[PDB]
């Protein structure tokens, strides 16, 4: 401690150390840095905003010839902590920032060993941007990335290495909406204007759907059924309109509710929304036929009642379907005609819908 005061003085007294300059023995020789990343918890996956908020410790490892010492020389010190701001460190940073703080959040002290090896792990919270593939809502797997790279040095003066392919889940609070499915990490190499090294971690997270399965899917599933039911209701109630309008707006409401949860992207259409929209189309065309029925129904004086049209509906269609009261009948039949159509189309439509995810 009193000797620590001496040891620190030697190593950081600027006469020996210039932080501004990277330490390697030869300028020919390159510095290699080891990078492993630890989840403490996955906080937020904002789909609308296309943003992953995680808190992360990134273990950074490298060696400095400048910071060696003999343990015998100073009370047998093996390891000493030093303020990261005063020593040199590879400016490793996210290149994936939405509204980003590019560097880490705490600037922890660095643990330095007597041989000049450095162990650093600062905590940070990170706001990574990933394209959100919204189709099979809410059972969706998001491959979300985050690029780490030295924003100062290229693949000449610094090289990057993984201590592990999978990211460390060591101290992870499991409780998210999301399940961690896989967490691999790759090292990438490509030449731009200058050669660079990319370290990319892939967070593959499966949403636990139970919430939106309840409070989104079930209600709109409930209300979509109502659509076909509208026909059965007889004109003479008057309520054929009420029930028909009520269903449409409920569906638009749920479509819009989904719209403001989903990201406003045009990459693809949310399967749920596509279904909710197509049934919505079917109910709007239901609405027009329901009106067409009612005008056929409610007036007999000075009416055409053209026999080949009354014969087709009363005499020809009625057994085809089953196997001024006549005016009421023709209404009943032109109704039940479309009902048979809608029941087939609806089930055929959901069969077509579910065929795609299967």
């Amino acid at each position: 401690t009193d000797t620590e005061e001496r040891l620190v003085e030697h190593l950081l007294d600027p006469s020996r150390y210039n932080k501004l300059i990277r330490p390697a023995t030869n300028g020919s020789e390159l510095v290699t840095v080891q990078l492993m990343v630890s989840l403490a918890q996955l906080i937020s996956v904002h789909e609308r905003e296309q943003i992953m908020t995680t808190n992360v410790w990134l273990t950074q490892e490298w060696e400095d010839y400048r910071l060696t010492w003999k343990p015998e020389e100073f009370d047998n010190m093996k390891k000493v902590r030093l303020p990261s701001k005063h020593i040199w460190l590879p400016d490793v940073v996210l290149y994936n920032n939405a509204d980003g703080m590019y560097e880490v959040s705490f600037y922890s002290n660095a643990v330095v060993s007597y041989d000049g090896s450095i162990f650093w792990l600062p905590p940070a919270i990170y706001k990574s941007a990933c394209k959100i593939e919204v189709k099979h809502f809410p059972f969706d797997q998001q491959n979300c990335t985050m690029k780490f790279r030295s924003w100062t040095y290229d693949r000449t003066e610094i090289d990057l290495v993984l201590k592990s392919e999978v990211a460390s889940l060591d101290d992870f609070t499991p409780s998210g909406e999301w399940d961690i499915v896989a967490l691999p990490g790759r090292r990438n190499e490509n030449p731009d204007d200058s050669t660079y090294v990319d370290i990319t971690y892939d967070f593959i997270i499966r949403r636990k759907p139970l919430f939106y399965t309840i409070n989104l899917i079930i209600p709109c599933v409930l209300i979509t059924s109502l659509a076909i039911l509208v026909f059965y209701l007889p004109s003479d109630c008057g309520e054929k309109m009420t029930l028909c309008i009520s269903v449409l707006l409920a569906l638009t409401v749920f479509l819009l509710l989904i719209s403001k949860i989903v990201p406003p992207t045009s990459l693809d259409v949310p399967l749920v929304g596509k279904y909710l929209m197509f049934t919505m189309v079917l109910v709007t065309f239901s609405i027009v036929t329901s009106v067409c029925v009612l005008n056929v129904h409610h007036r007999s004086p000075t009416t055409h009642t053209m026999a080949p049209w009354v014969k087709v509906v009363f005499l020809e269609k009625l057994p085809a379907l089953l196997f001024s009261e006549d005016w009421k009948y023709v209404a009943m039949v032109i109704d039940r005609l479309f009902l048979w159509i809608f029941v087939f189309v609806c089930v055929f439509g959901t069969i077509g819908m579910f065929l795609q995810p299967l």
């Binding site: 003085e9 492993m36 906080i43 643990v111 792990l121 919270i125 007889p234 309520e239 409920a250």
Partner: protein, 363 residues
């Protein structure tokens, strides 16, 4: 006063801020923890995030910061800016959307024996899992992990000055009351790293005072969920049989939807009242389907099957079974009335069974 300056001269003549300050190399610093909560502000359930205002009472010692009070006119406890003195790196493991620790860095007392007392304030955004079941009568266990970062147990060990969290200067005003606030001392190996690193986990148990949400959420949706069965009793020929149904279903969905935008959208547990308002909706939608099936067969008498074994099932068999142009049309008038009362029996029976299942926990 002149002495007070001269004291600072002698302290910071050759004093290293970056030195782990103990006499012996092996010997440790004892750092003491008194957690004084200033106010509980936001307990955002949807984000699973708690915003607290906290003083972090930290006490430790320097052999290098000792002096003789008689040598300097009986000055014994001098206040010195923390930034100049060595300081333990106490941090929150559990932080979200905030700086980890000690942003303000307020001044600390130095006693003449070299012990140092530091009580800086700070705003912490703890991230606790929110169990929503018995909304709004819910108790939440929210924790705050305070530990060192770079120093292991070998070099820093933490001590509880109280097991209980200090609530003496607390801002009572909230929709919550503190049930109990607990400090637990733990030690662990973390897998990244070799050594043992201690922590103090501070568990706030908080209960929501429900009387607000009791009024504006629970009472209206009970008042509303009443009307589900009432639809059946309304006569078909009024023409309002469905207008009541649609209003119930939609009004319910509004309350479910409003509730859901307040719940944390987790799949751990189903929010109890949400599950209730869900099953109500399932019954209502079912009630709409049947009440339309009531109206369809009800009106028309010409060219109708009117099979006797079914009309005898309804008018002659079931009518007393449940109790214990006009000729055909009014046959239908009763038949619908019976299909009606049968389901009114169904719903009013099952409704109470559902709510008995809702009150099984308080039972």
């Amino acid at each position: 006063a002149h002495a007070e300056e001269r004291l600072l001269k002698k302290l910071f003549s050759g004093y290293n801020k970056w030195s782990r300050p103990v006499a012996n190399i092996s010997d440790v610093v004892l750092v003491r923890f008194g957690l004084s909560i200033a106010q509980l502000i936001d307990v955002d359930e949807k984000n699973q995030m708690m915003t607290t205002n906290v003083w972090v009472k930290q006490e430790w010692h320097d052999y290098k910061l000792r002096w003789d009070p008689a040598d300097y006119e009986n000055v014994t406890s001098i206040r010195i800016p923390s930034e100049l003195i060595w300081r333990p790196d106490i941090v929150l493991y559990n932080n979200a959307d905030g700086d980890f620790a000690v942003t303000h860095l307020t001044k600390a007392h130095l006693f003449h024996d070299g012990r140092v007392q530091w009580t800086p304030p700070a705003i912490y955004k703890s991230s606790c899992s929110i169990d929503v079941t018995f909304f709004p009568f819910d108790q939440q266990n929210c924790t705050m992990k305070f530990g060192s970062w770079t120093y292991d147990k070998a070099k820093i060990d933490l001590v509880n000055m109280h097991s209980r969290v200090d609530q003496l200067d607390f801002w009572e005003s909230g929709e919550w009351v503190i049930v109990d606030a607990v400090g637990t001392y733990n030690t662990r190996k973390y897998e990244c790293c070799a050594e043992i690193y201690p922590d103090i986990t501070y568990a706030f148990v908080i209960r929501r005072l429900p009387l607000f949400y009791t009024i504006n959420l629970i009472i209206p949706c009970l008042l509303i969920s009443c009307l589900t069965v009432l639809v059946f009793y309304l006569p078909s020929e009024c023409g309002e049989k469905i207008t009541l149904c649609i209003s119930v279903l939609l009004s319910l969905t509004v309350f479910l939807l409003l509730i859901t935008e307040i719940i944390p959208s987790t799949s751990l547990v189903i929010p109890l009242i949400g599950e209730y308002l869900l099953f109500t909706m399932i019954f209502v939608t079912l009630s709409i389907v049947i009440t339309v099936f009531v109206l369809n067969v009800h009106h028309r008498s010409p060219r109708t099957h009117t099979m006797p074994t079914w009309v005898r099932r309804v008018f002659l068999d079931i009518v007393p079974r449940l109790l214990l142009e006009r000729s055909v049309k009014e046959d239908w008038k009763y038949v619908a009335m019976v299909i009606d009362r049968i389901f009114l029996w169904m719903f009013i029976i099952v409704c109470l069974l559902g709510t008995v299942g809702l009150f099984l926990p308080p039972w």
